[PDB]
Amino acid sequence: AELACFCYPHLENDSYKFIPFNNLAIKAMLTAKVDKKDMDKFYDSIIYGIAPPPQFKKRYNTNDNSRGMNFETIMFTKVAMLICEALNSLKVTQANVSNVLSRVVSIRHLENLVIRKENPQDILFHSKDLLLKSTLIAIGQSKEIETTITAEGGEIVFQNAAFTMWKLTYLEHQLMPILDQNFIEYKVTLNEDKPISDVHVKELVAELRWQYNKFAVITHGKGAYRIVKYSSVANHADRVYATFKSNVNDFNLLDQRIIWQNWYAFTSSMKQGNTLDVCKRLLFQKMKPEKNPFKGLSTDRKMDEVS
Amino acid sequence: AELACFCYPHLENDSYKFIPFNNLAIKAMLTAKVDKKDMDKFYDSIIYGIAPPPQFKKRYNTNDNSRGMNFETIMFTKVAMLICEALNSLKVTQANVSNVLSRVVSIRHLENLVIRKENPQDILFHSKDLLLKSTLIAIGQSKEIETTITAEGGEIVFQNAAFTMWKLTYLEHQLMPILDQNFIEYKVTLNEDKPISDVHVKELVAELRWQYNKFAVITHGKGAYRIVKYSSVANHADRVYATFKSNVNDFNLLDQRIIWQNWYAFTSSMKQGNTLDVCKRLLFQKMKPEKNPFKGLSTDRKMDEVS
Amino acid sequence: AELACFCYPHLENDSYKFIPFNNLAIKAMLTAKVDKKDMDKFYDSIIYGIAPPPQFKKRYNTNDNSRGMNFETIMFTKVAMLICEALNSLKVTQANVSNVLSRVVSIRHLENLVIRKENPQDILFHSKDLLLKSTLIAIGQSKEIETTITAEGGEIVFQNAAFTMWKLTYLEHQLMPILDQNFIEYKVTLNEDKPISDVHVKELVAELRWQYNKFAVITHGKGAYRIVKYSSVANHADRVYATFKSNVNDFNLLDQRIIWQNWYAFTSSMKQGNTLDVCKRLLFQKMKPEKNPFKGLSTDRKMDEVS
Amino acid sequence: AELACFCYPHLENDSYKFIPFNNLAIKAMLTAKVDKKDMDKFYDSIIYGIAPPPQFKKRYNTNDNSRGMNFETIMFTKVAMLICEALNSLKVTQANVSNVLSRVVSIRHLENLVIRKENPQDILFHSKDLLLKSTLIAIGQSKEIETTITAEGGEIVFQNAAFTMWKLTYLEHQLMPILDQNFIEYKVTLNEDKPISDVHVKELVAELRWQYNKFAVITHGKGAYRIVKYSSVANHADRVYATFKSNVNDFNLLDQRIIWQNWYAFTSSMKQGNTLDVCKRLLFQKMKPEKNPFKGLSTDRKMDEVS
Amino acid sequence: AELACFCYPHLENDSYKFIPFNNLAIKAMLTAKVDKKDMDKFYDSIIYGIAPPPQFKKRYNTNDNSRGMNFETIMFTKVAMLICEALNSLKVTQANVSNVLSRVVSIRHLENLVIRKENPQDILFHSKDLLLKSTLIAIGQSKEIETTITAEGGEIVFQNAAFTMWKLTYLEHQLMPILDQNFIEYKVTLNEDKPISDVHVKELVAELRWQYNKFAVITHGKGAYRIVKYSSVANHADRVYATFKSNVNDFNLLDQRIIWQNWYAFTSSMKQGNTLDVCKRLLFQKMKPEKNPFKGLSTDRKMDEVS
Amino acid sequence: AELACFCYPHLENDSYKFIPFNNLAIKAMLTAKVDKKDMDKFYDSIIYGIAPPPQFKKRYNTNDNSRGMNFETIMFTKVAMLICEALNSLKVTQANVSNVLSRVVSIRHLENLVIRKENPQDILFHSKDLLLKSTLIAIGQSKEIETTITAEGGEIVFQNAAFTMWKLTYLEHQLMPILDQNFIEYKVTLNEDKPISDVHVKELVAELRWQYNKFAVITHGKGAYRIVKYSSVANHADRVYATFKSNVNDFNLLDQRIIWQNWYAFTSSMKQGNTLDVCKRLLFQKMKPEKNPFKGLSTDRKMDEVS
């Protein structure tokens, strides 16, 4: 959803400070009869403050919408406040307020940051600087690449001198969980954005083949690996393409010894400018088996097990 | 009930400050043997403070009274305090204390104000001035007309540039709910007491015919519409008449394009001084169908639905 | 689903007797690796009997399918037995077994018949002849028209000398309920398929305008009225058209004073052979208001209420 | 309610056999649109059998009626069957069917008989003859006087060689309990309708003064004492009068040493033909204290206690 | 129990300050092997502080004692603190510490004072002076007479210009409730220890005969009436005698028009110095009925009821 | 455990009929003081019948034994009866009774047969002949090889024209479940003990690599595959060896293209007569990768997924 679904602008000494919406003001808005000429204008509930532009009605779950977010939960407020604390430290101007708020961000990524922020064991609970950087990345107001320190978090299922593998807890989310109960997905972040040895790539690749053999190692190109069911690569190919198509934009293919062969092809075809069908095609054909970089990984792990 | 059911007067530097009753002192009073010459005098429980005049015994629910209020709930205290905070800001004199306290007010209206007052999302939670004005109106110590800002509240089911429609939550009240579980009623307040366009009246009327076709649009004449079941107009006619009969008094017929035809007649007959039977009669006859002000409203909404 | 999802054929003295599937045999089948040349052949579980042809896998809900039926419930068995008791009384031949079983029937309609069949207050609980006729109609092996006696049932919300209005209890179904919790739909059956007076049509039409004003009176053309939300007429138009398109077929427009104006147009355009767009178009335009057959109905009911 | 609220007549070999109503047929009826010329005619639900004449709608509790009976409980069926088993043994004729069914009987009295009938410890559970006589008395098709054997039952709180005192369990009834939770009432039946000694009257009177001092000993004149709160004598006086007024009739004043002084006066004034006001008046005046028949009773019981 | 069951002495600047026992130190003590020469000496648990003299083992409930108190409840601590706050304000000396602590007090009376003390509606919650006086009376370190203000409290069932009647809530006590579930007892305190009119005595006596006819009005002679079951007067006679026998002492017969005839006799015989048998005898004989002071009380109340 | 833990012999007309033990007789036995010369003799409880020889005390779980069985569950009885129904159909003689009962059988295998036997969907519920054969195999009184029809059962996770793969439900067993909650194990039975094509072996092998990559395909040599965690092969190697060592014996290596390479080696070394260390050694070394029989299986399944 747009950042304009969580807060509204407010002039306060030349600078713009962002304020969170009360869920009841949103509720009033969803029952309000607005003019087509005001759908893009914030709404005054009179009783519970300002509400989002009524043109975003589809972002909030109601009795006939389960495709939006659960704005009546406390997580909506926590997430809104997180976005506000971030935007407030930018001192946006009377000309970006619009561009900034119309930005679409990942809700699951923000709620995941709230979970990190509130855990006193998480480093984010203690560093407003790290928390800030983590959030700016998520709301698209940063140039940095998400790494382990600034990751959205989740449950750690594998740690290496080079990477940290997380199990995404979207099914358990309060704000906008995933409805498909068969959902399983993992994210691998780079601990440090520096040179990674072969022994550390081999340690990870081995873990991925043995522990997650039914998963395809892909990437959305922003610096982290995404471990998803093969029966889901298609949908990912579509979303990443649609995104690339938005030229109006950098992509990181990541380590080719880790990314699934077909995904690397599909993505390189895309980075070369090709069409969708041309790309998608590559993703389906049983390409020529590349020279396995780390052979034996499977057998070794298997033998260790046997002891 | 009388305001004297929630508090008692107390001289404190020439001015009169009102104090709330402890529920246990009320309980003692209900078991007390008082003299007919003291029924109008406050009662001393000796143990829990001062209690209301024993002549009001019928206002409190007991084992043989369900026609009163649940004074042992916390809502009784919250409501009492609300009344006290209001009266204390008037600095009543040694001659009105009686007149003021003998005033009958709507308990459901006060408990509704407590619910608004305690919600941090409601503007009343932040404006003691607005809260004050809202309460003074309710306890009859104000000249202002209840509008959206100062309304008793409830659940907002429709908002317009001109009105706000609330669903009265009386069934859920702790202090003195409605016992009839088949009860449904809505209130429409004017957002601003100023000139209202036709397009905004049409937006409301359309909503009332489509969404509440089994409801009659009436008014008790204090500036707001009351949406009630047709099978309840009779009782309303009686209560509003009885009230008018109390000449010892202004009435607002409100917009004639909104108020149910028969109700407007019944009320105008009343504002002209007529009798009850003369009025009630008008309310039952299938009067001549007036020239529909906004024709087509029904069909339009219906067609929108179909898309 | 196809009737072949509930039972399988079995030669037994020249005649074909149908046997119900065990849910565990279906489960085995859903885990079975079948050859593309056997997808249309019944499956042997070896342990729990015969299962349906694996080409119907999509009819049964699993961890990745919620678009099918809950075959593990007792209702699956009850429904299967109902279908079997019906087919067994036909003595199908070695040439129809296929045609008969490949017939698609409404599961909600069958489960509704089980609910009637098991209630000792329902006449079906006592007439295997009426139960039979009711089921044959539902499984498409009958020429008769569903009337009140043979209806699928539900909760009776209005009864007339001529019609009976039922509230469809699909949300509560065990076998294949409706997932959309905002679903509300009613069915009106003719008590007797004979001449219906005007006073009895007027009694019904009045009830439909007052009690169900937000509902469009339509029909799927098999002899009964379907009362659905206007925001659902579109989907109905599609399903009825798709069905009509299946020329490889009779349609009953029903009483034109009852069916919604636009639906009658949409359907007559269809009975004339027209295209989809040509028809659908009629359904959206605010046609010229036909001469109201029973005027005043609204006001009368309203006045009765007021007493 | 009328006996016609539980069953309907049916010719079966010159005699009339009564059949119980299905609760669902009653429900259909309550939603049926009947003609004013058929309100007194049984109703055909088409689906659940015959229902009572729609003119009795007020006898059944619905969403807007709590003044009737809970016909959907099993007790409705049990009670209906009890009434049927009784009427069926009378072989009513083609001319009384109406008179018999229009008879108003006490529902609480019948449900009380069902409770006795189903307890294997109660003699009624074993004597269909005694059960029959008990029911005929209750439905007004008998000349006998209710005594201990044929009483409606309840909880036995005192037994004497001459009487049995029962605590009426109406608050616990399923079919038509009493809604006023402050209700307490007892009934005293004569074990044998023969000469009762003074020592046995004294034993009872003593128990009534010591154990039930806040209760007035009255009677509805059908042979049993009714022990009710003094704050309820008024309502009883009205109901017994209204009943007496129905000349279109015998009354038993019962033992004058037991019946409350004022009640005996009120009732004798009634048996003499007087008006209501003339009677009611007697009930309120502090009449001249009659010569206490059994003096000392109080002190004795008190002294026994002290040991 | 002795006050020495709740606290122990401690020299602190010439004065003696009392400290509460930890329940765990009591528990240790109950498992301790003490010498017969130390049974009267406080016990050191080493781990949880000082405990009471092991000679009081019988005051605490254990697995084989239900005749003591539940020292592990919070009420034990609250009660101990109440006793401490009282004794600490006396500044007892190095010669009374023993006499003071060996004093037996009523636990139910103290726990009742804790309940008053903690209720913010009770005046004791606000007056440490009144709380103090109330406690000193209870622990026998005061000359004052318990009146309504300083009563042990309970549920108020009747209030008069002169008296307040309380229902003792011993069954609900945490520290040392009454085990006999059939227990019911009331206490009547004098609001003011001054001249009481006849009309106010008559108001009370009337309430006692009508509302509590099975109760004997007695007194333990310390200024308040005790309303107990006649089947309990005997036990009371014994306890009051045993107490009187403790000459090593003033008694208040109270109003003779209120106290049960026999109790007044039994007590006057005692105040004259007589033996137990001589007294007890008076309590059983059906003495000559004294000239009823307020005749008619019964009939009046009865007549009021009837209206 | 020994079959002598479930029943005892009894001469009845030259033949020996087996009777089940009452759990209470076992309990008595576990508290009985027996002589070392009777430990092998059945025990008479006197009160609950005959119990097992006290030398088997270790087979029953008590307060200090969790290594046995839960003989107090109904499953103990059901299992005992199953064993009895089997032995009774053999008509054992006065010379085998001992040999037969001292036979150790798998309890989990028997309880699994009870679960099949009681399910009306399972073929065993209908064939006492098949049930019999299945049980005789399990208790070691049969020459037949367990196949799908006669398998111990469980949850079917894969079915082929040639095999059926079951998930062992030992964790859920009542009689003697597995305590290690991390336990997962599957069994693959041959549907028919006949020639199996390559396409059907390939279908299975593909399923085993994709769906169970962390599992080693082994066998205990009685005709079925056992799918266990690699971290469990060691324990299996020990149990199968210990068993082989019991020469006082046939082994089926099964299809070498399916059994894990190392397991085939370990087992062939055993079938050749070798020692334990010699065998175990083979199981650990990373043997030379044999020529993959069905290459590509992995990639194909993976590609199918992607569609």
Ligand SMILES: Nc1ncnc2c1ncn2[C@@H]1O[C@@H](COP(=O)(O)OP(=O)(O)OP(O)(O)=S)[C@H](O)[C@H]1O
């Ligand atoms: N309802 C939705 N649920 C999930 N994704 C959506 C939804 N709607 C749009 N998207 C897609 O979200 C993006 C892909 O999913 P995300 O996980 O949100 O991307 P991402 O968070 O940037 O990826 P990472 O974290 O860098 S590996 C595509 O740009 C969008 O097409």
Ligand SMILES: Nc1ncnc2c1ncn2[C@@H]1O[C@@H](COP(=O)(O)OP(=O)(O)OP(O)(O)=S)[C@H](O)[C@H]1O
């Ligand atoms: N127990 C009662 N319950 C509800 N109304 C009562 C009751 N007793 C008296 N009334 C009536 O209360 C008034 C009408 O109901 P209310 O809703 O309280 O009026 P109101 O609150 O002033 O109306 P609004 O808010 O201006 S539309 C009549 O003056 C009284 O007759």
Ligand SMILES: Nc1ncnc2c1ncn2[C@@H]1O[C@@H](COP(=O)(O)OP(=O)(O)OP(O)(O)=S)[C@H](O)[C@H]1O
């Ligand atoms: N999953 C589905 N749920 C509901 N309807 C479906 C579904 N799939 C197909 N249909 C449609 O079912 C038919 C319309 O719905 P139904 O209620 O089943 O028809 P119907 O039961 O014959 O109508 P009646 O009872 O005569 S008014 C259309 O022929 C189909 O397109």
Ligand SMILES: Nc1ncnc2c1ncn2[C@@H]1O[C@@H](COP(=O)(O)OP(=O)(O)OP(O)(O)=S)[C@H](O)[C@H]1O
């Ligand atoms: N809803 C009602 N509840 C109780 N009584 C009613 C009700 N409606 C009418 N009655 C009265 O019922 C009768 C008195 O109550 P009942 O207890 O039913 O009489 P009764 O059962 O004949 O008295 P007994 O058993 O001989 S002492 C009066 O004739 C009626 O006025």
Ligand SMILES: Nc1ncnc2c1ncn2[C@@H]1O[C@@H](COP(=O)(O)OP(=O)(O)OP(O)(O)=S)[C@H](O)[C@H]1O
């Ligand atoms: N376990 C016990 N339970 C109750 N009373 C006891 C117990 N043991 C001794 N007593 C008696 O307690 C006294 C009478 O009971 P209490 O109610 O405690 O007296 P009291 O509290 O002084 O009376 P009041 O309050 O002035 S009317 C007698 O002096 C004792 O015999």
Ligand SMILES: Nc1ncnc2c1ncn2[C@@H]1O[C@@H](COP(=O)(O)OP(=O)(O)OP(O)(O)=S)[C@H](O)[C@H]1O
């Ligand atoms: N407590 C125990 N739990 C499991 N197995 C045991 C236990 N005690 C002994 N065993 C072993 O049981 C055998 C192997 O386990 P099982 O599964 O019972 O064999 P099995 O049932 O014959 O194998 P299948 O069914 O033919 S593949 C070995 O012969 C024994 O060493």
